[PDB]
Amino acid sequence: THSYRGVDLEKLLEMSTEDFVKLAPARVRRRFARGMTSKPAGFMKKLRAAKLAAPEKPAPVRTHMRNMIIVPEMIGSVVGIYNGKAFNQVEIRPEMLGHYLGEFSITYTPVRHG
Amino acid sequence: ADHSRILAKRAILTGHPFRFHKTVVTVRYMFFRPEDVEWFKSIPLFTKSGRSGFIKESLGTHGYFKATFDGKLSAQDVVAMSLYKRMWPMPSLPWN
Amino acid sequence: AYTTVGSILKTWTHGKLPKLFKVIPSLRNWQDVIYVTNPEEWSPHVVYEATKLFVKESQKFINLILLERFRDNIETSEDHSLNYHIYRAVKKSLYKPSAFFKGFLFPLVNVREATIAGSVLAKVSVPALHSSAALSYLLRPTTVFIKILLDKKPYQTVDDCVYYFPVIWHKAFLTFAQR
Amino acid sequence: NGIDYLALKTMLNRDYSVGNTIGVGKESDIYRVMKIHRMHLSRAANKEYQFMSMLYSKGFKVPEPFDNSRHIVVMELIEGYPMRRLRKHKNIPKLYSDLMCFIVDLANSGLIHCDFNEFNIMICGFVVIDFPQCISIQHQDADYYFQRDVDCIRRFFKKKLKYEEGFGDGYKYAYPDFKRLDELVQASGF
RNA sequence: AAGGGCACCACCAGGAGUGGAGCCUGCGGCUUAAUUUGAAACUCACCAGGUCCACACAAUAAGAUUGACAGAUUGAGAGCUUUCUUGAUUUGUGG
RNA sequence: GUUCUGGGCGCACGCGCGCUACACU
RNA sequence: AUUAUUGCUCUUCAACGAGGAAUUCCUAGUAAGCGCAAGUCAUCAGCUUGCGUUGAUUACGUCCCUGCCCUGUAC
């Protein structure tokens, strides 16, 4: 099974955010201790409604919030992440925990000097 | 009778230069796709005030371009380019 | 101290204005307490927002600092011209003409500032019963803006021409002949 | 200085690739490869073209010259890479041996290089790409410059490759020595 | 309309170096939606995507219009649901 | 025009000013 | 602070053996070695200017090279 720093997947999802922050490395702990802004609350509000009404997957919700931490409450959701130009569609698998959303949408093309 | 009397249908496209720099100017409305700016890149430009110039490259997705000219331009000038098409005579019939 | 609300005045134009400032006009002492908000630190967007919220004692605000910020904004601006939101606030002023004249008019009596101010004062209509008083005060080149205020097309106005009888001074005198 | 553009006109008309920029240089600029020399005296280019043409008329491993006019020269583009970054060739003993025999040929043709060194050899498996300030075999310092080349190539094989009828181990003699066409192009020393 | 003078941005006698390796950085070129001409926001001037904003005739109004609680809608939102409040500027065609 | 959110100020290569070294001073 | 500002700890250990053709600065408390302070600045320099510490070798000349300034015939 999946496990995070020794905590098993089935005890995750039950774990709250304010519990989860105790496991995370220093960058995450400072970010929450310094007080995360209100802006995720509206995103979280919408994301819950889509999951609850879902028939099976919840279909994408899209956002500009690239600087947002992935947190267990949102596991399994499908999200469209803005790219400065387009939206990229991603599904929150459990391995994504503690990463920033921005890591999944590439702001620049490759270059090949053709 | 002279079949060599070639007729060419001339066309003039025109666009507005709107931002100005010490080495380049950029022009709107002449094209609307980056693909078009690239396809017609090689044709020389001229101002009606008489300066010549050339396309550098496409800028952005709306078909803006930026270009270089013989000297200072300003928004009171217009940028044009000329194109030519072959024409042929039609036949004729008696009248009574 | 009111600076706990006044500290936000440097950015209030980005969105919904604070209720701790927007409620301030509800207090009759606010004509003196409003100076406790540090209004000179207010961004022009809030000055425009405050101008819409400031709507005869209101002339004590319009002339008490608003015209001072106007002259400071044009005189302090690196291009010598009022900022858009100050200009939009100025044109958004004048909702009472006697306040515009009694506050912004006679106390305003360089030439580059008079021309810019006139370019707003021609932008909207005015009541003829007020314009008759404006001509009498203008009948008192910094007064040459009276050649624009008369361009809108009373027995005391005829008498003012008899008491008043550059190319703008001759041109304004010619326009005063148009009947 | 519009000649810096208009000089093309003979080559532009007589020559078909557009070519591409390869590098700015101090004496000349290089751009299927075109070399442009650097107001009057450079029309030097004829000296270079005839010199290269002669050596390529011989059997030497040099690029074929195609055409030359108005201080413009066109040459075969090189396929290899610069020797100074070579580290692992599969037959270093034959490579050492035969670089030595190349010097013998120049001496038999009466010529000596000034700087037969890794900055102008490109990767027999190799080609020699230019001949700055060449001298005749008759010049008063010919042997001094001759031995410098031999030791220069020996030093490289020692330091990087650790190497240290033919020449070297497996042949009767370790390396050539000075005592063991100039009049057509009298670069120096008749 | 050939001689003379002078200078380590010239040399001579030398010193310390550059050019060779890794990295920082300026320009050209390449790439890209844009890579604008003591840059994480702004700066910022570039890109994608969102709101919001003369006069003369004919129509129109004592309700022309203005403003404000609680709540709303998008990828980016605020007195649009609700209902009080104020009192002379709105819609077409010809600068 | 005004203003808000996100992005940008990448590298096959050529030229130049620098930093750190190749050790026993 | 993700495509990562800076600092700390452990681990990984690349090229490089004094560098071709070319080429820069300099005559005494000067060159060179070494470090500090200010500047910009929420944070962030291997940058710029100033300051101090240690402290040489080689000329005291010339028109060879480069460049500048004076006074009609093979061009």
Asked if residue C52 keeps its beta carbon closer than 7 A to nucleic acid strand E, the reply is yes
Q: Which two tokens stand for residue A5?
A: 């720093």
How many CB atoms sit inside 10 A of residue B72's CB?
A: 10
Q: What is the distance between the alpha carbons of residues C67 and C61, in angstroms, rounded to a whole number?
A: 9
Distances (CA, A) of C131 to A21, C156, D181: 70, 11, 107
Q: Which residue is nearest to nucleotide E36 (CA to C1')?
A: B21
* Residue A37, C-beta contacts closer than 8 angstroms, at least 6 positions apart: none
Helix, strand, coil shares, percent, chain B, to 5: 5, 45, 50
> B64 with B27: CB under 8 angstroms?
yes
| Residue D115 falls in the annotated catalytic set | yes
Q: Please tell me the number of Cα atoms within 13 Å of D178 on its side-chain side.
A: 18
In DSSP terms, A79 is beta-bridged to A61, A90
* Domain count across chain A: 1
Q: What is the distance between the alpha carbons of residues C149 and C108, in angstroms, rounded to a whole number?
A: 14
> The tokens 């001229």 sit on which residue?
B46
Which chains have 3+ CB pairs within 8 A of B?
Answer: none
> A58 with A77: CB under 8 angstroms?
yes
The per-residue DSSP string of D137-154 comes to TTSTTHHHHHHHHHHHHH
Asked if residue D170 keeps its beta carbon closer than 7 A to nucleic acid strand F, the reply is no
Backbone angles phi, psi at C34, to 5 degrees: -65, -30
Asked if residue A22 keeps its beta carbon closer than 7 A to nucleic acid strand E, the reply is no
Q: Which two tokens stand for residue C151?
A: 């361009």
Backbone angles phi, psi at A19, to 5 degrees: -75, -50
Q: Give how far the C-alpha of residue D169 lies from the chain's centroid of Cα atoms, to the nearest Å.
A: 27
> B34 with B60: CB under 8 angstroms?
yes
Q: What is the distance between the alpha carbons of residues D189 and D114, in angstroms, rounded to a whole number?
A: 14
> C59 with C99: CB under 8 angstroms?
yes
C-beta pairs of D73-79 under 8 Å, 24+ apart in sequence: D73/D34, D73/D35, D73/D36, D73/D37, D73/D45, D73/D48, D73/D49, D74/D11, D74/D15, D74/D33, D74/D34, D74/D35, D75/D33, D75/D34, D75/D35, D76/D32, D76/D33, D77/D32, D77/D33, D78/D33, D78/D122, D78/D127, D78/D129
Binding residues of D for ATP are 35
- Residues 137-176 in D having a C-beta less than 7 A from any atom of strand G are 159-160
DSSP code, position C8: G
The resolution in angstroms reads 2.9
> D62 with D55: CB under 8 angstroms?
yes
Q: Which residue segments constitute the domains of chain D, with CATH numbers given?
A: 3-76 (3.30.200.20), 80-164 (1.10.510.10)
Q: What is the distance between the alpha carbons of residues D111 and D135, in angstroms, rounded to a whole number?
A: 6
Q: Give how far the C-alpha of residue D59 lies from the chain's centroid of Cα atoms, to the nearest Å.
A: 14
Q: Determination technique for this PDB entry?
A: cryo-EM
Identity of residue C110:
N
Q: What is the distance between the alpha carbons of residues B37 and C50, in angstroms, rounded to a whole number?
A: 49
Q: Please tell me the number of Cα atoms within 13 Å of D29 on its side-chain side.
A: 7
Q: What is the distance between the alpha carbons of residues B46 and B78, in angstroms, rounded to a whole number?
A: 9
> The tokens 């270089």 sit on which residue?
B68
How far: C92 CA to E95 C1' (Å)? 24
Q: What is the distance between the alpha carbons of residues B28 and B62, in angstroms, rounded to a whole number?
A: 9
Q: What is the distance between the alpha carbons of residues B63 and B31, in angstroms, rounded to a whole number?
A: 5
Q: What is the distance between the alpha carbons of residues D37 and D42, in angstroms, rounded to a whole number?
A: 6
